[PDB]
Design a protein around this ligand. Structure first.
Ligand SMILES: COCn1cc(CN(CC[C@@H](N)C(=O)O)C[C@H]2O[C@@H](n3cnc4c(N)ncnc43)[C@H](O)[C@@H]2O)c(N)nc1=O
Ligand SMILES: COCn1cc(CN(CC[C@@H](N)C(=O)O)C[C@H]2O[C@@H](n3cnc4c(N)ncnc43)[C@H](O)[C@@H]2O)c(N)nc1=O
Ligand SMILES: Nc1ncnc2c1ncn2[C@@H]1O[C@H](CSCC[C@H]([NH3+])C(=O)O)[C@@H](O)[C@H]1O
Ligand SMILES: Nc1ncnc2c1ncn2[C@@H]1O[C@H](CSCC[C@H]([NH3+])C(=O)O)[C@@H](O)[C@H]1O
Lengths: 343, 341, 343, 343
């Protein structure tokens, strides 16, 4: 089998590539000006990294990044795409008179064969919390086509996590779960399922944005170097943390966001999804605790955020956190595949 | 005596100690709606007092007896069980009414009066009207009432109505979920979560609210003090059938009460409804542990059962259902330990 | 099984995961019209349930089976294919009804019932009535129905009506014209504008509307669940002849549906019509690619052909013409991927 | 028993009913300073608990016994007189510590413990430290303490200090002057004005205040729980001689208290001082009937005599004089019925 199939449930792959086969979704990604513009800036301002070079675009979709590479003077670009969007990319390559420079290769990057090794790999494989969709693994897998001296755009990825307080959000989810608390819904006693319901709602990472004032400690950083990492490194991601609490209050969970860096020869360009930066279509992600932890300012909040890759192109998240001064511990399970889009 | 038989000593001690404080008397006296309405009911029905023999059940500072004196009563027996009776006597003397107000120290169930009275005055209303169980003392005092004599107040109406207030609900649920946490300073409290919910939701909420939270016109339960007997208040069964005017979550039942002084010249009402100026009685709300969903036009039916206990209060049982769907709620409350919000 | 042959693995997995969530069951349960009307239909026809054998096809949380129990059913077989079946089992135990409700995990096409039933209950309706193809499971279950048996619901009416909505129509070109720009970050996107238009118009629109946009009395197509077979729903041909009540441009066809519970005591209706309180089904509108002009009194005639596909949905083919002018329009829609427009 | 001999039954009923409420236990438990400092004192002195026999006097919810268990205690006898004992028993079971914690329902003066203990833990402090008279139970429990055994807390300090607060003083007369009107609804109430003043001044005021109202360093009275007998708390005579730091009118005495946990590893202090974060004990102020003028450098001397009564509280007798001027004032207060002024 291919590396993709061996790690991916068929149902998930079918659904996944059907999602990206729609022009409306491509439009949605393209209209994220921060993203699209920052990519174009990272590529054009490092034009020497592309000038007369061989390029691989992993998961090119409509092909916009391959066009940026073409603008930067790349002589040959292999644009790999597994969804049917590949046909639409071909249309744009012809209508933009770039048939001699951009070559669409339909299929999964783990299964196609490229005619030659490339000087640089470009891609946008970041999902929610950076790791959702497991496309970073495809990105890393594609390094089998990278020359020894090769480069990756983006080059590194930073995941930031920080504790937050937000009673409204907490109560908003708790209210949804308490439906299953009723002893007589149309005469039916549902309460025996309330535990299972709370679990289910709190299993949902919350995707949306927020005021930075809800953050109770400076973030902890976890970095993935795309030039150095291997695929298998992402099957199990262990992020330890030790927060020094800047404010007193209830910690309702952990907030996540990510930065990527295009480390080019001319300059390094950053693409950030932090809540201190303009909103992107990645927003930010929050994992709620079923029971918040009370912490005093100056306390230490320690524990681990554990990501286990599953066959549905996503991760099982286990977060365990503890207030060191009191031993108050919280353990939580989340399913990154199924988030709650709150925005 | 009837009083001691139905009352635990500990409760009685705490109860009469409470009313022995001048500050509390000041509190009741500075409720202007209450005091003014009482004075109005007595003075505008002055003929019901003119040259009459009066009994004041639980006179406290004696203010109602002074109102009776202002209206021309010939002799007023002011019975008071707390030490406040001493202070009432001081005021009787300093107001030169020794010939018209006679203070009787002791419980109305135990003291001896020299004669029968033409009219009984008292202010025995508690939270939900019935808290403190003083209405029974008031009814008990009718053994001193001449056959056609009168009662001030004459009747009392308890009003019930369903309400929606998720803020209140979640405010209490938040308090109970403290006992939900699996690691408080490392200790798992969750096994007590149920007991915590029960305790918190047993508490009637005393406070006021905007009338728009009411989802149906109130149902009325009436006690006629002229006809009622003491024993009638031992077990109070209030059936209700609400016709829902609004759709939404019913979080519980709101209670308040009116009393009427049905005098010969006019009927004067004293009201604690949320549509009227606030009194020191406020209003009382009983929460359901789980709210009931109802659409407008539905009927909410059930029973409110009040059982008198030896702690001078009531055990409250509320059973309610949305008839159209069978959605049912049952709740037990302890009027003894309310939440003053 | 009959189910597996008519359903792609990929679609079935996503489908039963969807219904495995308590929140989704809750969403259906909190539709008061839906749930209350089912309860009302069952309880007010208690003679159809008193001491009877009942089958609940796709019981979900088990709510309809509890309604059957409230009506006095002797035995209810509650069949459920998703993982919700266990939660249903929990509720049966905690409601002390284990001696009357038997939860059978699995597809109704694959499980075996120990005996024949007197009545079948189910809520198999999707958008436009037919979406999700669960009506076929409902009909398939009649192999367990006594010759005497009844179906709750008994019949289903799909209503079609022509509408005018200039804003909805123009919205499609407004969204698609994103691609009609010669230099999006230096890329000429215009060659995909046509494909983007096609994509938007293939989407049935889910939401509600003011009834004044309807330009003719609806045409009705009826399925009698007592008489129909599974195969009858593989190819559904709905001819129509609308007599225009208003003059104007016809932008497409609006769809909604009613079902009726024809019991021994009374008939109870559940309607999702735009004249009734909103339900979670809303209404569905299929646009014409080219609007048709009609004067009041003119006739709009044609056909709506629904062809079942293995993605548990239908390919919708609509052809319409104004008989007085001969001016014609078409459209092909994919009911599996509707556009949820409601806000 | 010793308890009944010193306690009126009505008061005892009221007292244990109060602590039978989960809300009251929660009130004490959510005091982070109190609870955190107990936990800290116990855990940081783990050698005082490891494999030891512990007695928890008035365990309430059992929170301190769990701390003793966290510190490695071999066996903990948790004695509790109210109905909270059953709830503590539940938590012991649900926290799997039935082999380490034994809940004993009943009064510590009445129950039978099987063996002597190495250390006694308790939180028996009331307002002004001594209110509720539970410290005597704590000391009484030493009949179960091995010689050389320890007490947590080990000592208790009550602090007294003179204060100025013109607002607080005038307030008593503002409230009592309600009665000083010749026609309240036609009634001359003035004859009760003196009695009203007396009543207000007998009430110790419970609430907090700005430390700038304090006019001299506090005088400290220390009870060593390892050395003291219960009978030592029946008549507590606190002489004082304040060296005035500020000039002005002294309106009364402010009270607060500290306890110290003197362990083998370290001493941990729990303070309810007005210089520390607020606790549920707040502080207590007792007024003089007549304020005393004092110049900075003067000495204010006298006595605070606390006399235990059968209502689980004290009659407070304060006599004070400005030594340089001979100006004298006194007050007699009823600690059982304090005025909760805090807002
Ligand atoms: C929705 O929110 C934004 N977003 C975007 C992306 C990236 N996108 C699209 C980017 C691309 N269209 C462009 O324009 O750069 C993924 C694209 O890559 C394709 N793809 C994925 N795994 C593949 C594989 N093994 N082999 C070949 N192609 C593969 C897939 O079909 C898409 O066309 C993401 N990872 N998470 C997100 O949340
Ligand atoms: C929370 O709100 C306050 N509140 C106030 C009152 C009224 N007050 C004073 C009434 C009168 N002094 C006036 O001034 O109106 C009651 C007075 O009645 C006395 N009393 C009670 N049972 C007695 C008995 N068997 N024998 C003799 N005296 C008895 C008791 O000692 C008080 O002094 C009330 N009934 N319900 C309330 O809720
Ligand atoms: N062929 C099938 N066999 C068994 N269950 C099915 C089948 N097709 C759909 N279902 C289930 O049928 C349910 C339809 S949703 C209706 C749920 C529930 N009866 C209620 O009235 O609230 C979903 O829970 C599906 O998982
Ligand atoms: N003589 C006594 N014997 C047993 N328990 C008592 C006695 N006097 C008071 N108590 C209880 O002691 C507790 C004091 S409150 C402290 C509770 C708990 N140890 C904590 O630290 O949170 C209350 O639960 C009282 O009921």
């Amino acid at each position: 089998r291919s590396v993709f199939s061996e790690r991916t449930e068929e149902s998930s792959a079918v659904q996944y590539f059907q999602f990206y086969g729609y022009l409306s979704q491509q439009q949605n990604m393209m209209q994220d000006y921060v993203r699209t513009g920052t990519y174009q800036r990272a590529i054009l301002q490092n034009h020497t990294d592309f000038k007369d070079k061989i390029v691989l675009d992993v998961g090119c979709g409509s092909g916009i990044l391959s066009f940026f590479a073409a603008q930067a003077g790349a002589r040959k670009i292999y644009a790999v795409e597994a969804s049917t969007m590949a046909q639409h990319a071909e249309v744009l390559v012809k209508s933009n008179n770039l048939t001699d420079r951009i070559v669409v290769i339909p299929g999964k990057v783990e299964e196609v064969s490229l005619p030659e090794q490339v000087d640089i790999i470009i891609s946008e494989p970041m999902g929610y919390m950076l790791f959702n969709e497991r496309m970073l693994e495809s990105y890393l897998h594609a390094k089998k086509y990278l020359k020894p001296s090769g480069n990756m755009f983006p080059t590194i990825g930073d995941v930031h996590l920080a504790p937050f307080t937000d009673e409204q959000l907490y109560m908003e989810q708790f209210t949804k779960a308490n439906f299953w608390y009723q002893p007589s819904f149309h005469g039916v006693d549902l309460s025996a399922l309330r535990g299972a319901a709370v679990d289910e709602y709190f299993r949902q990472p919350v995707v949306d944005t927020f005021d930075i004032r809800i953050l109770m400690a400076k973030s902890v950083k976890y970095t993935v170097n795309f030039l150095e990492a291997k695929e298998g490194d992402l099957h199990r991601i262990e992020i330890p943390f030790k927060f020094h609490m800047l404010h007193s209050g209830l910690v309702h969970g952990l907030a996540f966001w990510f930065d990527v860096a295009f480390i080019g020869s001319i300059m390094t360009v950053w693409l950030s999804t932090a809540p201190t930066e303009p909103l992107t279509h990645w927003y930010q992600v929050r994992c709620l605790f079923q029971s918040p932890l009370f912490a005093k300012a100056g306390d230490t909040l320690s524990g681990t955020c554990l990501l286990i890759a599953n066959k549905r192109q996503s991760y099982d998240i286990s977060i365990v956190a503890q207030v060191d001064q009191t031993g108050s511990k919280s353990s939580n399970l989340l399913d990154l595949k199924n988030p709650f889009f709150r925005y």
